[PDB]
Design a protein around this ligand. Structure first.
Ligand SMILES: *[C@@H]1O[C@H](CO)[C@@H](O[C@@H]2O[C@H](CO)[C@@H](O[C@@H]3O[C@H](CO[C@H]4O[C@H](CO[C@H]5O[C@H](CO)[C@@H](O)[C@H](O)[C@@H]5O)[C@@H](O)[C@H](O)[C@@H]4O)[C@@H](O)[C@H](O[C@H]4O[C@H](CO)[C@@H](O)[C@H](O)[C@@H]4O)[C@@H]3O)[C@H](O)[C@H]2NC(C)=O)[C@H](O)[C@H]1NC(C)=O
Lengths: 669, 672
């Protein structure tokens, strides 16, 4: 009941070497051969084993100067740390073949900082062509400390320090149980100990382990600091991809807001206090994460120069808008051209493609970075390697901070400003000659919470003894997560001539906060894409059934590594972990319903699938179409020029079943 | 002694048609001609009423969707709305001929939002070259709800519901009387409750109906959203007149402030609380107009995005100046030419000429629109057809708000920063060789308040019965500023025999302190009284000029009742057709003081250069090479202003009768 895939001899060996690097991540097994290789591995001597002579040499210059020390906390948002990560990445990426790649990782495991290494290695496995189709573990199994509050962490430490339970019945009262040879820890979301404002209503979504894993994967698939030359025709669509990822996410987030009675993400000002604080319960081996109190003055002394930069970055965009056509960064740009999204997105991201370069440079200040830093409310870094981490210093923690959504909402709104320059689609562009959707029905939509466990053993240090006996996997975290029942969408379509067609499904809200029905005019960016697929219509009447379990845009829960070691002994590999790893998890498709049925709408659009003109398959198997991302809702709409027979809006209601509140799953006795 | 123009019988017929659409604009009479004509006007089948096929089809596209519903507020400052009014105007403006225009308007008068209809209709009448000479009602007779304070509007609605006066005596005590079987309502200017500060001293100017109407006419004579290609060579001077119009108006306003002891127009920041609040005494179908308190914080959550936009809109200008020569909207801008002058004004107004297109496009954001939105204090619109109005949402009410003068002051300062790059006039460009002004004499300059009536019937409702005879007779009576006639006498030694230009301005003599203004700091504070050409001959001679002849001022518009009386005699009022966009002359002088408030009169005589024959948009474009406002169009070197052909003359402006307008509207009391 987990989507499998079969696998040969050479594959399993490599995959085992790859997975070796994600276990006991913060320690070293002296007896493991990865260590014997690693200790003595000579990079200079091996120079002929890399595609890029200057990458080896650049790495070597940095490595003698000195890399970040071990145990210190790694973040890519800081110059020196990132530069070392990139130098390391290149070395992984330009290794002639697997053997060389493997050995280089061995050395790097042994000699360099843990976070820096996993960061670079993870990315490398995703980017190397010979590695395509291999599997990596879930971010939460690799970095467990970042996916869980203190309370849990500390129970784990205590149990480990005691080598078990002094009182099993007392431990039980704290949600700690022995299940055969596992220690299982129940975990509440933070609102169960902290309700310091209404945003805490959303913790089952913002603290969700999958959602946060999802953002991490997105970063890794194409990090901002690197070109996208490797992905070919997506290079000319990179900005579009950046807008759409964020647009989709904020729609999804917004949906969660609506169902907990919260409305719009609030606007903010670099020159004013920001309302909602963030009080993180994460610990770092060396420090606590930094808090932002409520009404925090973003314009305090330490931030003056920072705010001057950020304000100018924005103002420079506002200038672009005002002048329509202009030259910036070596490019004549026209805001009338829909292709300009590429520039717009690239600018807001300060990625390598903005400059037409392979890697970004220190003097090219990113807006995202400094915005993250200021809103993170940290004191000034002590030095190049010693900073006070906030949620927004890591891709694995960002979604936890309401301020993150404020920051990307603002960015998305500026891109929407650019999108106002595009002419709206006319009838002719949308009309599907002789095709009409006559009905849509939907099975009941119910959400519900359900326990989920993940391997949390990397959070813990084992003894020399335990590392040798390989007893390194006995810590699991149990947590209630959002889920929903599978559902069919029944679509009835009429057409004169048989034809190849594209079907698209979107989710959007039905009402604003006041209970007025949504116009497309104001609300086209609040539509969330559920699925696209192709069918063949016949003359007459058509019945199209599509199940939620088969929506192209979502993945299944990933499998724990231990379960993957099991499968590799059988020649099996978890399919969704191989090629669908960076999709949103299925269980989070729907926002949490209400007991009464919260009102939403399904938008179904059917259009002709002409041929395979402009065709994305290098980055994402997403857009085998000539069409903008989120077509037909990638620009302003006029309600009356828009609605055509091959469109259907269906009113639907999202229900919720069982326990309403995650914490009711975590009570003892 | 009200200027007449004779007019033939074909004219009477067309003028009567046009005037008839202004009767009871707020309701529909099923037996008005316009209603029959609209019933009979098949619009789908009328492609051949229009010179421009695109306009027609563009209108039908929007038409089939639908328009702004009747009864809602209309403002061109909201985009969806603007795109519709513009479609309506294109229809009006490209109608083959008069028949075609009339059917179109009747149709619009019936089936369209009354605000939108009146806006497009006014503009089209001013713009169509076959209608150029027809007369329009004063805008306060077409939109009285924009010119009457709530108090008065309510009293009228009350009198209507009662079908008249319970008893005379009760009514008279409330400022309500009958004269010739019409109702007259005495109206005060508003008090400390709508102008909760010193700006209330000046309410008789800022609420003046002439002065508000003037701003409306100014806009309608060349609207921002339209290019100016209709006006030929004037196109290359559009931005110039924009500065001039606002520089003159603020100069007029600062002089009022000085007589009422109020000092400089205040400056402000988008990042700070704005001092002078204003609570507009108006309401729309759904909403009381938005109120702005004293010390209102401009910088709040709701305006952040707008403020960012405004901020970079201004700082870009700084960047242009800093650089001298820069790429801007197609060409290189060189600051030392006058293609620069034109650019500067078009930039600040974001008008259609800035982009060199025919009409303002849907996505081009305006500085002035967003400024008015921030300063208007209103909540954000409920939907695209429903906004919450503020005084700044309309040219009819704009001059009522202190913030309006503050905003344009700021734009005018910015332009004056650019004007620092302009080369000053030399001795030889201003010296009129062979001619000297030896002296200037002026009759007593006297202001006073006197009553002024207009029919406000368009803001009153009428039964199906009463409508059958175009009912009216609901007059508002108000004390309004005025002055007596006066003659300026100019004495001159001359060697030469040429035609000459005589210009006259009024400006301040002392600042709020008590110190003489110096020209370098005061040139922007002069407004033009007059311009004319004169044959001069050698020796001593003297030119006489009566205030009744000043070029830049008009007589009060007649009410429609009077327009019709005159029509039946083949007569047309000159000032209403030859010069509507001109300041009423009653406001020619600031209110004086009983002892005489000191101002100065600049009299300037220079040689006349025969400049061709045009037909420009305003009365302010005189047939002269010279910049608008010349020689005070640009920064001054004071040592060059002791020219024999210039003369600064100190004059006092007196006031007579009651010093305060309320003293005219007290029941058992009569003034002076
Ligand atoms: C309490 O607080 C203090 C203050 O912050 C902490 O003190 C710091 O501790 C760290 C140790 O954790 C120290 O770093 C070490 O410094 C050593 C020497 O530093 C200098 O010398 C390096 C070596 O070069 C020398 O060569 C010749 C000798 O023949 C001389 O001519 C020359 O002067 C040099 O000194 C230089 O390269 C360097 O620039 C320094 O100026 C280092 O030997 C040592 O390096 C090792 O460790 C690195 C770990 O990342 C690794 O990269 C290297 O490969 C190498 O093996 C090490 O970094 C700081 O010096 C010290 N700071 C201060 C200001 O004194 C203290 O740790 C903390 N205590 C607790 C309990 O928390």
């Amino acid at each position: 009941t987990i989507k499998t895939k079969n696998v040969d001899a050479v594959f399993v060996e490599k995959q085992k070497k790859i997975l070796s690097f994600f276990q006991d991540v913060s320690q070293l097994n002296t007896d493991d051969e990865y260590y014997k290789i690693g200790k003595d591995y000579d990079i200079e001597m091996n120079m002929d084993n890399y595609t890029n002579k200057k990458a080896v040499e650049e790495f070597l210059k940095m490595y003698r100067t000195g890399f970040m020390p071990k145990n210190l906390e790694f973040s890519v948002f800081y110059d020196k740390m990132r530069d070392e990560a990139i130098a390391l990445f290149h070395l992984f990426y330009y290794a002639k073949d697997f053997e060389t790649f493997y050995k280089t990782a061995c050395f790097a495991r042994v000699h360099l900082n843990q976070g820096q290494f996993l960061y670079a290695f993870y990315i490398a496995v995703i980017q190397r062509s010979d590695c395509h189709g291999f599997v990596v573990p879930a971010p939460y199994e690799v970095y467990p400390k970042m996916f869980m509050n203190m309370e849990v962490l500390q129970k784990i430490y205590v149990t480990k320090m005691q080598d078990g339970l002094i009182n099993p019945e007392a431990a039980a009262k704290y949600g700690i149980h022995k299940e055969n040879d596992y220690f299982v820890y129940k975990a509440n979301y933070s609102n169960a100990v902290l309700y310091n404002n209404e945003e805490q209503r959303l913790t089952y979504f913002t603290e969700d382990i999958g959602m946060n894993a999802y953002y991490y994967y997105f970063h890794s698939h194409l990090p901002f600091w690197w070109t996208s030359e490797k992905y070919g025709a997506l290079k000319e669509r990179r900005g579009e991809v950046y807008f759409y990822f964020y647009q989709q996410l904020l729609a999804r987030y917004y949906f969660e807001r609506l169902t907990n009675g919260l409305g719009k993400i609030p606007e903010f000002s670099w020159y004013s206090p920001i309302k909602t604080g963030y009080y993180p319960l994460m610990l770092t081996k060396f420090t606590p994460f930094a808090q932002r109190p409520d009404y925090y003055n973003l314009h305090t002394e330490e931030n003056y120069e920072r705010v001057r930069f950020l304000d100018t970055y924005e103002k420079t965009f506002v200038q672009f808008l005002q002048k329509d056509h202009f030259e910036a960064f070596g490019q004549k740009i026209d805001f009338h051209d829909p292709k300009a999204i590429n520039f717009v997105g690239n600018y807001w991201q300060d990625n390598a493609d903005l400059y037409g370069e392979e890697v970004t440079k220190d003097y090219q200040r990113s807006y995202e970075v400094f915005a993250r830093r200021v809103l993170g409310a940290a004191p000034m870094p002590f030095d190049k390697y010693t900073f006070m981490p906030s949620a927004m210093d890591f891709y694995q923690t960002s979604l936890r901070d309401p301020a993150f959504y404020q920051l990307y909402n603002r960015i998305v709104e500026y891109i929407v400003e650019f999108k106002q320059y595009l002419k709206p689609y006319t009838q002719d562009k949308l009309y599907f000659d002789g095709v009409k959707i006559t009905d849509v029905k939907v099975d009941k939509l119910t959400t519900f919470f359900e326990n989920f466990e993940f391997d949390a053993s990397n959070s813990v240090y084992f003894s020399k003894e335990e590392i040798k006996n390989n007893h390194v996997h006995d810590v699991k975290v149990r947590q209630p997560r959002l889920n929903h029942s599978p559902f069919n969408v029944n679509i009835e379509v009429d057409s004169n001539v048989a034809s190849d067609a594209v079907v698209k499904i979107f989710l959007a809200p039905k009402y604003d906060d006041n209970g007025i029905p949504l116009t497309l005019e104001d609300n086209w960016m609040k539509f969330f894409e559920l699925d696209w697929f192709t069918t063949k219509l016949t003359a007459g009447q058509n019945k199209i059934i599509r199940n939620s379990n088969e929506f192209v845009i979502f993945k299944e829960d990933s499998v724990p590594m231990t379960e993957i070691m099991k499968m590799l002994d059988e020649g099996k590999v978890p399919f969704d972990m191989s090629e669908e790893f960076c999709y949103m998890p299925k269980r989070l498709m729907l926002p949490r319903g209400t007991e009464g049925g919260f009102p939403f709408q399904l938008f179904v659009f059917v259009y002709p699938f002409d041929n395979k003109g402009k065709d994305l398959a290098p980055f994402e198997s997403f857009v085998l179409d000539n069409k903008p991302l989120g077509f037909p809702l990638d620009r302003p709409v006029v309600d009356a020029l828009f609605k055509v027979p091959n469109m259907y809006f269906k009113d639907i209601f999202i229900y919720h079943e069982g326990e309403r509140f995650p914490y009711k799953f975590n009570i003892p006795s | 002694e009200f200027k007449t123009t004779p007019v033939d019988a074909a004219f009477v017929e067309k003028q009567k048609k046009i005037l008839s659409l202004f009767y009871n604009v707020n309701e529909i009479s099923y037996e008005a001609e316009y209603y029959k004509v609209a019933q009979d006007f098949n619009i789908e089948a009328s492609k051949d009423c229009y010179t421009n096929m695109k306009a027609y089809e563009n209108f039908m596209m929007m038409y089939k969707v639908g328009f702004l519903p009747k009864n809602l507020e209309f403002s061109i400052f909201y985009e969806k709305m603007r795109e519709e009014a513009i479609a309506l105007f294109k229809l009006f403006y490209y109608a083959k001929d008069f028949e075609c225009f009339y059917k179109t308007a009747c149709y619009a008068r019936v089936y369209m939002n009354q605000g939108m209809f009146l806006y497009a209709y006014y503009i089209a009448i001013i713009q169509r070259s076959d209608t150029a000479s027809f007369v329009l009602p004063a805008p306060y007779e077409a939109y009285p709800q924009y010119f009457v304070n709530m108090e008065v509007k309510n009293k009228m609605d009350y009198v209507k519901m009662m079908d008249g006066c319970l008893d005379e005596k009760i009514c008279y005590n409330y400022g309500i009387i009958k004269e010739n079987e019409q109702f007259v309502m005495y109206a005060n200017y508003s008090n400390s409750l709508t102008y909760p500060n010193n700006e209330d001293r000046i309410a008789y100017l800022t609420e003046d109906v002439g002065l508000n109407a003037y701003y409306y006419y100014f806009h309608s004579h060349l609207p921002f959203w339209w290019n100016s290609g209709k006006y030929g060579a004037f196109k290359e001077r559009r931005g110039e007149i924009y500065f001039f119009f606002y520089q003159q108006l603020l100069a007029r306003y600062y002089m009022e402030r000085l007589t009422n002891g109020l000092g400089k127009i205040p400056e402000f920041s988008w990042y700070s609380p704005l001092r002078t609040g204003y609570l507009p005494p108006f309401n729309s179908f759904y909403y009381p107009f938005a109120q702005r308190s004293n010390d209102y914080e401009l910088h709040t959550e709701k305006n952040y995005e707008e403020i960012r936009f405004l901020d970079i809109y201004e700082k870009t200008f700084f960047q242009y100046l800093q650089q001298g020569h820069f790429k801007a909207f197609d060409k290189k801008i060189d600051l030392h030419s006058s293609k620069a002058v034109n650019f500067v004004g078009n930039y600040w107004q974001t008008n259609a000429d800035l982009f060199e297109e025919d009409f303002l496009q849907f996505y081009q954001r305006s500085y002035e629109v967003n400024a008015r939105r921030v300063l208007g204090a209103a909540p954000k619109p409920f939907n695209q057809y429903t906004f919450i109005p503020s005084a700044l949402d309309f040219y009819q009410t704009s001059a009522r708000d202190p913030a309006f003068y503050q905003l344009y002051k700021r734009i005018v300062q910015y332009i004056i920063e650019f004007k620092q790059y302009q080369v000053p006039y030399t001795q030889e460009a201003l010296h009129f060789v062979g001619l000297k002004i030896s002296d200037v004499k002026v009759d007593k300059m006297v202001t006073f308040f006197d009553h002024f009536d207009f029919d406000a019937f368009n803001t009153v409702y009428f039964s199906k019965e009463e409508l059958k005879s175009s009912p009216h007779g609901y007059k508002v009576r108000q004390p309004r500023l005025n002055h007596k006639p006066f003659t300026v006498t100019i004495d001159i030694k001359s060697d030469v025999a040429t035609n000459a230009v005589v210009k006259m301005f009024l400006g301040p003599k002392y600042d709020e302190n008590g110190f003489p203004f110096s020209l370098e700091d005061n040139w922007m504070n002069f407004y033009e009284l007059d311009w004319f050409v004169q044959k001069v001959n050698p020796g001593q001679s003297q030119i006489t000029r009566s205030s009744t002849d000043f070029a830049f001022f008009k007589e009060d518009s007649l009410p429609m009742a009077e327009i019709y009386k005159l029509l039946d005699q083949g007569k047309i009022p000159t000032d209403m057709f030859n010069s509507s966009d001109t300041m009423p002359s009653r406001l020619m002088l600031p209110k004086g003081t009983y002892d005489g408030f000191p101002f100065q009169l600049f009299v300037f005589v220079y040689p006349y250069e025969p400049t061709p024959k045009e037909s420009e948009p305003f009365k302010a474009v005189v047939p002269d090479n010279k910049p608008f406002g010349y020689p005070f169009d640009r920064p001054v070197l004071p040592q060059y202003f002791k020219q024999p052909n210039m003369f600064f003359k100190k004059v006092l402006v007196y006031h007579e009768g009651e010093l305060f307008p309320y003293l005219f509207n007290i029941p058992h009391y009569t003034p002076d």
